[PDB]
Every structure is written in structure tokens, then in C-alpha cells.
Write a protein that binds this ligand. Structure first.
Ligand SMILES: [K+]
Length: 130
């Protein structure tokens, strides 16, 4: 009944955490939304703050390693950065893979966290309309 979308970044730090937050609110009904990383770098505090600003709570989120069982059951795996795209394991033939690249806001001014957060929102809204 419910389909599965899996957002992947290098360390499950910011872009993938914001994608999971937006995904749960926009695609909530018929979608199970998860996020993971090749490595675990912790949840960037600025990513939590960025989502709080748009009234989305991601304070309980964890930085998790990619799981083979979630990959096998995914309808769509979305990679958000180039290293994650190349390091993602070879997927089952029935699992679709898409690369939605977004700039890394880490170490940049707060305005870049705001910008990337909103670009991710628009990409997920475009996905909902498919
Ligand atoms: K996660």
C-alpha cells in the first residue's frame, strides 16, 4: 500500500535530514520516508534549526548508516551529493535510483541553509505531482 523513499547523503547530516523532514510532511499519506548515509556524521544542528524555522520538527532524527534491507524494499532511492551517488551499493533491478543534487550548506553562511532547505521543498513538491 505505502511506498518507500530513501534519501542518501555521505554522512546523513543535513540535506538528507531536511529531505526526510519535508518528505514526511508532503508525502506522508502513501509514503514511508527514511534517510541514511554511507557514514554517520551526526545531525547538523543548523539542519534542525532550518526545519524548525518552517515549523517542521526533526529534533528526534538520528544519523544512520545505509541498510541493505531498506535498499531492497525501496521504491525509490534518492542520492543528494556526488560521493553518496558513487558509493551507494549496486541496487536490486526493481529499485529505482535518482540523483537530486543540492549544494552542501556546511561551513557556509546561514542563508545557504535557508536556500538549500527551500530548494529541497520544491523538489519534493514536484515529485508529489508525478
Ligand atoms: K536517518
Amino acid at each position: 500500500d505505502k511506498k518507500t523513499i530513501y534519501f542518501i547523503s555521505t554522512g546523513n547530516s543535513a540535506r538528507s535530514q531536511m529531505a526526510e523532514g519535508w518528505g514526511k510532511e508532503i508525502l506522508g499519506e502513501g509514503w514511508n520516508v527514511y534517510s541514511a548515509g554511507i557514514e554517520t556524521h551526526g545531525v547538523n544542528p543548523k539542519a534542525i534549526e532550518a526545519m524548525k524555522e518552517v515549523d517542521i520538527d526533526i529534533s528526534n532524527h538520528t544519523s544512520d548508516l545505509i541498510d541493505n534491507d531498506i535498499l531492497k524494499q525501496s521504491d525509490l532511492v534518492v542520492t543528494l551529493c556526488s560521493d553518496a551517488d558513487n558509493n551507494c551499493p549496486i541496487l536490486p533491478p526493481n529499485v529505482k535510483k535518482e540523483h537530486w543534487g543540492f549544494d552542501d550548506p556546511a561551513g557556509k553562511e546561514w542563508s545557504e541553509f535557508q536556500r538549500v532547505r527551500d530548494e529541497i521543498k520544491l523538489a519534493i513538491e514536484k515529485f508529489k505531482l508525478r
